[PDB]
């Protein structure tokens, strides 16, 4: 009683204090300002909705003794929220349940009592036409059910609450989605429930019929409204099609909705990565690595970066497939160092010319690369290893026996030492001839690449590029020009006095 | 006090980084560490050190003496403000807040130093405060805070000449330019070795001489070496007492290549066991080898590989794998033949090599302004 | 000692003598501009990144 009675009564009111201001101003604002006049293209409860996701991902942790969220559910679910005569008592109903928490015991929502927290769209003049109020007031209880996820019999409460959310969702799919941002607002709520909706199904359920309903959701996307159903319904489509991909990729090649042309700086950003691994796994390398880089350079200034740990790895997987290699620990972190230990040692083996060193790493972290889901792409690097060897030696020495390079490259065979270098001429890595009769490999001294067209080519790749970044810094410089109202020439009365004094000076 | 203060950090190196070598450092570093009232900077060095649980009372008598100097600052700060000589509290801790810099940590130092910076209207104490901030920025290697007070430092010397505050400053920029791998600038700050002084931090002038020759032998070419270090009497008379360094310089200038690797292994070994050079000892000799290879190899065109083992340094397969990784490293301009046993050189132009670093900096700055270009405007 | 430059052959003592400064003035003068401008962009954080 002293520890509970002194440590337990302040967990209600200060979360009550913030929740009288976050979703009560998002409630008072998003209802009368999306279902109201308009939420414009510069919406505010979209990003306010982002804040009322991200604070709530890290807001609830405990099983909610003293009803600090457990009493928020029977408070915030009894809501007409119809108009100021009906919400004018709801503003008291934000406070009357605080007498129920502080004075009495409320309904402790602990894994059993969520079903009597659901049928309130029937209760007390609650509707569905205000789906700015009922999709936000659907999600706002749909989130903390699945935020902890705490998999013990909550999957069906989550599930049926997602079914009521699917009643609101299908009502958006068919019923008056125009000029209210019903569809435009609930694409955000659609994707944000597709995250938890996704991870429950990845946890314990199937995956493949929500694919078909997702094809219906994409079917009704792009037709009635042409934003954000074009965007999120393709990463959220992709997320296990990659993990169960094969030929479907060509569908994403021929997809019209590859571009939504705007995807709010993060869905576009991870989107270019999700399609980057497509060309990575289906062997288009050089086209992949530039959208790997472009997908990398569009991520925020936050620290929890596991997907950036993934793209930081895969981004130079394909560059190791292409021979070029930068340094990767130039921004190394305590969350990046342990996840780069093995991988920097892998590319350390690749940047050497040794043969079985590749095996000395592949036995060491082949299971780690299976845990990375990349081992079938790791396995093909020995081609690039022997290209590194033949380019290194062919550049270094000039007249060397073929009965030395196989032993130095531990090839165990000089009889195909003619043959790998033969495909180095077929690939054109080295030019000059092998004295196949004698045994030595001569190489000419090809110098003066300075008198070639190619340094102008390496220029011309970059001339138009830096002109384009100048031009985009010109097109993006058209947002400050405003409030240039009155260009007064000189005056009016001073012009009249100039006419008077000028008339006096001419009068003299 | 901050004048013997660098030997402390050098002996923190000598404690920590050589694994086997950790006994005399916890002898003499304790010998200086639980005397002259040092309390704060060796608790984590005590974690890296042994248990030393007996030193609790040693910490208590010295937090007691630290409390004594603290409380007599607290005895000075009221008669000091009672009659105003020149902000006499800060005239007390303009000498005793540097004690507090040694004794306490950087914080009670820094607020008393940025505090006391506004007291002396002439820079004759300001620039000494800035020197103190330079030295503690070196100790905690505050590589951003040294950039501030180097500029704020240099902004004060132009009024006056203050060459005992400018060449003395060039010692600091020399030690930072050799702290980083900026050697052609490090010898350039180590240019004079004449106005340089019998220091508090290099109490051997001759250790400063060894430093400036070790950075000069990479930093400058033959014309410079064949006039500057070879004809300087002031640089000659101090390596006159050096048996190895005079040999190690003259083995390179006098084409004594075989012993040059021996003395090279000596100086590289001590450099491996040296503070402030142990960050770049491998960087040093990988430039020394390719430097000597450039020196001998850029004389002849048809000199064979087997010639160099007996006159240059032993190991034919060593010269094989050693030049092979340097041509393969894209430097050391020659082209070796193998199965007729001859080494051939060429000469490249100053075009493609000078082109290379231009496309490097162009791609680097393109990455920079591209990244910032995505940083601004969402 | 680079006061004269050329080559010296060992088999019979041949001195191929050659001289031209190809281009010296251009790429370095265009090069140090780049490292000025990099410092300028580093200064653009301290009026851009911290500011807005």
């Amino acid at each position: 009683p002293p520890g509970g009675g002194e440590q337990e009564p302040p967990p209600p009111p200060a979360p009550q204090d913030v929740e009288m201001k976050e979703e009560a101003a998002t409630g008072g604002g998003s209802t009368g300002e999306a279902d109201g006049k308009t939420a414009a293209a510069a919406a505010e409860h979209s990003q306010r909705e982002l804040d009322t996701v991200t604070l709530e991902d890290i807001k609830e942790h405990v099983k909610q003794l003293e009803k600090a969220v457990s009493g928020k559910e029977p408070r915030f679910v009894l809501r007409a929220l119809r108009m100021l005569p009906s919400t004018s008592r709801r503003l008291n109903h934000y406070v009357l349940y605080k007498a129920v928490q502080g004075f009495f015991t409320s309904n402790n929502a602990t894994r059993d009592f969520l079903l009597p927290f659901l049928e309130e769209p029937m209760d007390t003049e609650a509707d569905l036409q205000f789906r700015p109020r009922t999709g936000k007031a659907a999600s706002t209880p749909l989130l903390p059910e699945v935020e902890a996820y705490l998999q013990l019999l909550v999957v069906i409460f989550m599930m049926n609450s997602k079914r009521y959310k699917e009643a609101q969702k299908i009502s958006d799919d068919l019923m008056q989605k125009i000029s209210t941002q019903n569809r435009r607002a609930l694409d955000l709520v659609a994707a944000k429930c597709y995250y938890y909706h996704a991870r429950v199904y990845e946890f314990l359920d199937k995956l493949d019929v929500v694919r078909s309903f997702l094809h219906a959701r994409l079917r009704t996307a792009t037709l009635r409204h042409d934003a954000d159903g074009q965007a999120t319904l393709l990463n959220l489509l992709l997320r296990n099609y990659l993990h169960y991909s094969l030929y479907d990729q060509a569908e994403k090649l021929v997809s019209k909705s590859v571009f939504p042309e705007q995807a709010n700086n993060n869905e576009w950003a991870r989107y270019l990565y999700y399609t980057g691994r497509i060309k990575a796994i289906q062997l288009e390398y050089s086209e992949a690595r530039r959208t790997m880089t472009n997908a990398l350079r569009k991520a925020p200034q936050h620290t929890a970066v596991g997907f950036k740990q993934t793209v930081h790895k895969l981004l130079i997987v394909v560059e190791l497939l292409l021979g070029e290699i930068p340094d990767r620990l130039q921004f190394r972190q305590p969350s990046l160092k342990r996840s780069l230990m093995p991988y920097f040692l892998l590319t350390q083996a690749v940047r050497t010319g040794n043969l079985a060193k590749f095996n000395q790493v592949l036995d060491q972290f082949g299971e780690k690369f299976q845990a990375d889901g990349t081992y079938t792409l790791i396995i093909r690097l020995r081609h690039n290893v022997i290209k590194t060897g033949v380019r290194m030696i062919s550049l270094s020495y000039s007249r060397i026996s073929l009965a030395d390079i196989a032993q130095k490259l531990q090839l165990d065979s000089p009889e195909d030492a003619e043959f790998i270098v033969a495909k180095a001429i077929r690939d054109g890595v080295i030019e000059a001839s092998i004295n196949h009769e004698k045994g030595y490999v001569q190489s000419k001294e090809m110098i003066d690449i300075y008198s070639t067209r190619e340094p102008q080519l390496a220029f011309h790749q970059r001339i138009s590029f830096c002109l384009d970044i100048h031009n985009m810094s010109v097109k993006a410089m058209r947002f400050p020009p405003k409030s240039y109202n009155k260009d007064l020439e000189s005056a009016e009365e001073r012009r009249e006095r100039e006419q008077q004094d000028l008339e006096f000076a001419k009068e003299m | 006090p901050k004048n013997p203060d660098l030997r402390i950090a050098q002996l923190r190196f000598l404690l920590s980084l050589p694994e086997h070598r950790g006994d005399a450092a916890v002898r003499d570093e304790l010998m200086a560490a639980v005397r002259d009232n040092n309390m704060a900077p060796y608790y984590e060095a005590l974690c890296k050190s042994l248990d030393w649980q007996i030193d609790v009372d040693l910490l208590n008598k010295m937090k007691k003496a630290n409390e004594d100097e603290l409380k007599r600052l607290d005895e000075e700060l009221e008669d000091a403000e009672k009659n105003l000589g020149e902000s006499e509290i800060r005239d007390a801790m303009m000498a005793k807040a540097e004690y507090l810099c040694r004794i306490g940590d950087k914080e009670g130092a820094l607020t008393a130093f940025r505090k006391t910076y506004d007291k002396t209207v002439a820079l004759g104490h300001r620039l000494d405060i800035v020197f103190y901030l330079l030295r503690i920025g070196l100790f905690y290697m505050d590589n951003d805070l040294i950039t501030r007070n180097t500029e704020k430092a240099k902004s004060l010397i132009e009024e006056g000449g203050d060459w005992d505050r400018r060449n003395r400053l060039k010692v600091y920029q020399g030690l930072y330019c050799v702290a980083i791998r900026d050697f052609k600038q490090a010898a350039e700050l180590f240019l004079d070795t004449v106005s340089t002084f019998t220091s508090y931090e290099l109490m051997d002038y001759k250790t400063f001489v060894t430093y400036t020759v070790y950075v000069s032998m990479i930093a400058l070419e033959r014309p410079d070496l064949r006039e500057k270090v070879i004809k300087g009497a002031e640089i000659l008379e101090v390596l006159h007492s050096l048996p190895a360094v005079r040999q190690y310089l003259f083995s390179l200038y006098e084409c004594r290549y075989s012993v040059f690797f021996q003395s090279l292994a000596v100086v590289e070994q001590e450099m491996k066991k040296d503070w402030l050079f142990a960050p770049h000892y491998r960087y040093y000799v990988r430039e020394m080898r390719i430097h000597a290879y450039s020196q001998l190899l850029e004389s002849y065109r048809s000199l064979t590989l087997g010639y160099m083992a007996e006159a240059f340094g032993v190991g034919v397969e060593f010269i094989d794998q050693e030049l092979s990784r340097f041509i393969a490293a894209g430097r050391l301009h020659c082209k070796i033949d193998k199965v007729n046993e001859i080494v051939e050189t060429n000469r490249p132009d100053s075009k493609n090599w000078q082109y290379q670093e231009t496309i490097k900096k162009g791609d680097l700055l393109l990455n920079r302004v591209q990244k910032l270009s995505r940083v601004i405007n969402m | 000692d680079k006061k004269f430059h050329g080559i010296l052959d060992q088999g019979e003592g041949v001195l191929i003598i050659f001289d031209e400064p190809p281009v010296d003035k251009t790429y370095e003068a265009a090069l140090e501009t780049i490292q000025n401008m990099s410092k300028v962009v580093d200064s653009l954080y301290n009026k851009a990144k911290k500011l807005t």
Binding site: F459, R462, I463, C466, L467, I469, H470, S473, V474, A476, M477, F479, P480, S483 | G362, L365, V369, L372, S373, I376, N377 | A30, T33, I34, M37, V40, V41, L44, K47, A48, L51, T52
Partner: peptide, 30 residues
Amino acid sequence: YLASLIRSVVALHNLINNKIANRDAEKKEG
């Protein structure tokens, strides 16, 4: 390549000069 390299930096610096004219005008005027 040098001139085209510097020109974009010029326009970038001007865009900084415009966003300072935006962000300290929207709150100030209202």
